[PDB]
């Protein structure tokens, strides 16, 4: 999903904001890997 890097700490474990409560809440019982990736404009315009 899309989320700015200015709120990368909202998805951190133990946070008390509205995203971790009502929106997507991560399950930690299985090996996860959260990745905050930035897709640049040229390659974004390439593949629609």
């Amino acid at each position: 999903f899309a989320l700015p890097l200015s709120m990368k700490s909202t998805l951190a474990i133990g946070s008390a904001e509205a995203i971790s409560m009502f929106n997507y809440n991560q399950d930690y019982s299985n090996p996860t890997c959260r990745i905050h990736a930035t897709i640049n404009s040229n390659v974004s315009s390439s593949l629609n």
Partner: protein, 48 residues
């Protein structure tokens, strides 16, 4: 010259406070921001 306040025998609204603050990073152990919004503790000392 930083200010310090101590709050005892008190109650507080987390949604009121977090409506004005864009949190960028929190690091801590022995407690979590979710725990501070749920549990009750003896005293609260704030420096800012």
């Amino acid at each position: 010259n930083y200010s310090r306040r101590v709050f005892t025998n008190c109650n507080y609204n987390l949604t009121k406070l977090l409506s004005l603050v864009e949190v960028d990073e929190f690091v801590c152990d022995k407690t979590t921001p979710e725990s501070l919004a749920t549990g009750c503790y003896s005293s609260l000392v704030v420096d800012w």
